[model samples]
Target: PHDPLDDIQADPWALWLSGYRRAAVLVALTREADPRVLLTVRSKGQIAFPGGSLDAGETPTQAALREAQEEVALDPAAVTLLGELDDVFTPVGFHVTPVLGRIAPEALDTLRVTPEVAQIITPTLAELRAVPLVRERRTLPDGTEVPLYRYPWRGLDIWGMTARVLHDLLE
Candidate 1:
């Protein structure tokens, strides 16, 4: 299970859900002390991970690290990247790459949640699958309810593309 040569890479296209919205990708890192995946609750009311679009001349890895710091005030040096997951398609129409990473709970101290992000959360695997977290409704225009995944933890709902990506990770 060791990738001695570190040979897993993916080709992903970056798309924006909104013309002016910044693009980004986030990876959920669980702690060795616990089975919790890091999450953030946006002031705009969405549950998500740490990520942002490339800043002109930066690589995806650089973007990931920078965004995490900019949005959550996390120190890049403290994060140990695990790997990258497959490309993910968001309902909002963006192709995002989940940048996997690992870090200790102590690192949380240095975080300064951005005004755009209300609070950072770390829910356990079982907590992420709890009931009352799902929303059964069809999407407008498409009219596709499609049974989207949802998990209610600390009064926040983790669903949509975020849920899909999380599901893949748990597997």
Candidate 2:
């Protein structure tokens, strides 16, 4: 599938920013009856998936699974690699690769979050579809107006790159 950012790459600013971009995330979907996705709330209140920057000599999938294990104690061997989604570029100069995976429903219960993750939220697909998404237009430095999406859930707002990845997956 073609990436949404394909055409936007012509922008000089985006080209310059790409040089420093290196990050990936695990879009872990649980094998539950309701089919839920795992998310985390940072100490500062930002909601995110269980992932982070890539390590030296690590592939996107490797980094994703490693970060998931480090941040949430998710065992790599227990999850099945489903594949990858479209790459998302953040305004802050980071390129994120969303790696899809599926694990047993029981694994969600055994998850142990780190200090960086304040809490874990496993909302079902039904629940995510039920929530109303707040959409907005954000202007990039190149005068491009990109759509921004967010979901308000249980006193927390899932927005930014997290929301972007979720929107891509859930859609």
Candidate 3:
């Protein structure tokens, strides 16, 4: 019901305190009994959730909602606010927050994917959970073996930061 990142003071200029650039993506679910989730493909052919950098005068919450509208023509009022997920820190120097919400299923039929979004996929939560995470055991710089979580949809894969957030939602 409240801005999850409210107390963090994440503005870029306000960061004399030392920080990462802040951004937000709405990890939205369809307002249906099955409750599918939204994942958008970037124009560059990378899969990602609908989002971008925060505007100067707005919070991450507002920024994500606005991006959803811009990318998918999602009316803000049709989304029901949920809480937030643990923020993901990317190597590209951004602290990305996944803002949670439930969007009307009708948005799918009228979805107008802008240039920012090449495609939009709404997969049932169960469908995603059924796809076993595929990962190659990779060695870190320090020789630590880490298991990456990669959720595959048909052929295109949802990995990296987007996949991490999906794991949090379904795990």
Candidate 4:
């Protein structure tokens, strides 16, 4: 699940301060009958976090909450910040912060599905651990094949930057 050259890559950047494409990731957790991380399938047919590029003068955390709300109608107050994850930059130059949060079990049923999202899927920690996860290679815009983190979750291919971040969090 790791390699020696990992540390030699570009230093993990901070969420907003990195000056690249900064955004927040909400590792929404629900604890009650079941605890799971809330994930979404973007309308683009990709598994993704509720996030977008940073807006002018907007903080990374703020953008995270906003994207969650806008995409799936996740309430801002319902999200309790846990901490932040190490920022990873894609070869295309996106600096992102994986924001952590806890979404009370009650918040799960209240989530609203908006146009940007096709559906909301909650995959438990155990579900993630049940599969083999690793990086998959893709040719970047520059025509160079670069590695991205990925895992098989509920029949979906969780690859690309989203998978990379999730892979780190799981570890």
Candidate 5:
């Protein structure tokens, strides 16, 4: 799969620190007999990972964990870091990293989301795989057509960058 940043140029470190660039998100999967990936509904009513803009001194992983902790009340210590996905560059000029991790199933039951998060969903890999993605063509300002994928599971619609990240990881 091609990275979203494959054709884009941006220093992950430099751009984030200067407040001119990126945000980091946590793509946390639960560790249980029946594992599930966690998803959150943003204040804007969009389905996304628990994440946001980085603070000046935070590394991508640190920012990811911080955002996850803030949004879902996840305990940083309970999560087992599983590394990161490729940096995804958005059309809006923000470069984002999807930090991957696994949390205990017990932790999932205790999750408490902030107001910024409208709700949470834990979809299994099988559940995600079973859903057929809806693809749409989007035209950029420069007359370029881009393919976008959306996965509709239960009542949550995961699309755009969030959908891309999940699809990339699943693939």
Candidate 6:
């Protein structure tokens, strides 16, 4: 199954990814009239999609799907590959690709929370988009500053690579 999205040529941000490792996240959504998106958080407050470093012999898509499965017990076969977002260069030395897809709403019901995740959340699209913005500047390791954009949910901030991907997905 060849997806046209696989042909995407994403721009590189060499400044951040000078010696970065590659990662991929599955930006999965529920299949329904009023769909919701999948979200996961670790023991800490870091909100994220199911993602990790790309494994050997695996495409970004393959890695994204595998991560989703390992993290939230989301069946890879159930994912309907929609497309891929441009690769993001992160301050933490990561080149992440966001793979968007839809999974059956039923799939959300039985999600097994493995040690890879502390929580699994499915928020309505509107709710996710309506999260309050918390803006600031982050001073990086090399003494350079970059503007930060994070949505505040509950008590934690959804910033970093996750924030970058979410902003691009909604746009």
Q: How well does candidate 2 match the true structure in TM-score terms?
A: 0.85
Native-vs-model 5 lDDT? 0.74
| TM-score winner, 1 or 6 | 6
Please report, as a residue range, the 10-residue window in candidate 2 with the lowest summed lDDT.
Answer: 10-19
Ten residues in sequence with the least summed lDDT for candidate 6: 3-12
- Candidate 5 collision pairs: none
Question: Tens digits of per-residue lDDT for model 2 on 1-171?
Answer: 122232232233332111145678899988867898988876646677877767778999998999889889999998899998888886756688889999999999999988767889987878877888887776777887777777887667877677778888887
lDDT of 6 by residue, 69-129 (tens): 9888899999999999888775545677889999999999999998757898776767657
Q: At residue 94, give the lDDT of candidate 4.
A: 62
Residue-level lDDT for 15 in candidate 4 = 18
Q: Give the per-residue lDDT digits (tens) of candidate 3, residues 130-170.
A: 88777555554556554456788777777766776787788
Candidate 1: where is the Cα deviation over 4 Å? 1-23, 91-93, 129-147
- Angstrom error of the Cα, residue 13, model 3: value is 28
Compared with the true structure, all predictions reach lDDT values of 0.62, 0.76, 0.72, 0.69, 0.74, 0.73
Listed per model in order, the count of residue pairs whose N, CA or C atoms clash below 3 Å is 2, 0, 0, 1, 0, 0
Supply candidate 5's per-residue lDDT for 147. Answer: 63
Error at 103, model 1, angstroms: 0.4
After the best TM-score superposition of candidate 1, give how far the Cα of residue 13 lies from its true spot, in angstroms: 20
Give candidate 6's error at residue 66 in angstroms. Answer: 0.6
Better of 4 and 5 by lDDT: 5
Ranking by lDDT: 2, 5, 6, 3, 4, 1
Q: How would you encode candidate 4's per-residue C-alpha lDDT over 116-152 as one tens digit per residue?
A: 6789988877777777876455564557665565578
Which pairs clash in the backbone of model 2? none
The segments of candidate 2 whose C-alpha lies over 4 angstroms from its true place after superposition are 1-19
Point out the higher-scoring one by TM-score: 3 or 4: 3
Q: Which candidate number would show the highest lDDT if scored against the true structure?
A: 2
- Per-residue lDDT of candidate 5, residues 1-171 (tens digit): 122232232221211101136778899988877679988875537677877767778898998898888889999998899999888765557788889999888898888988777788888978888898787776667776666667888866777677778877787
Taking all chains together, the TM-score of candidate 4 against the true structure is: 0.78
What is the TM-score ranking, best to worst?
A: 2, 5, 3, 6, 4, 1
Estimate, for each residue in 1-171, the C-alpha lDDT of model 1 and write its tens digit: 221111111111211111122244657465765567777877636677777555677766787788788789888887888887775654444455678888787777667887767888888777665545554544444553344455666766666657656767766
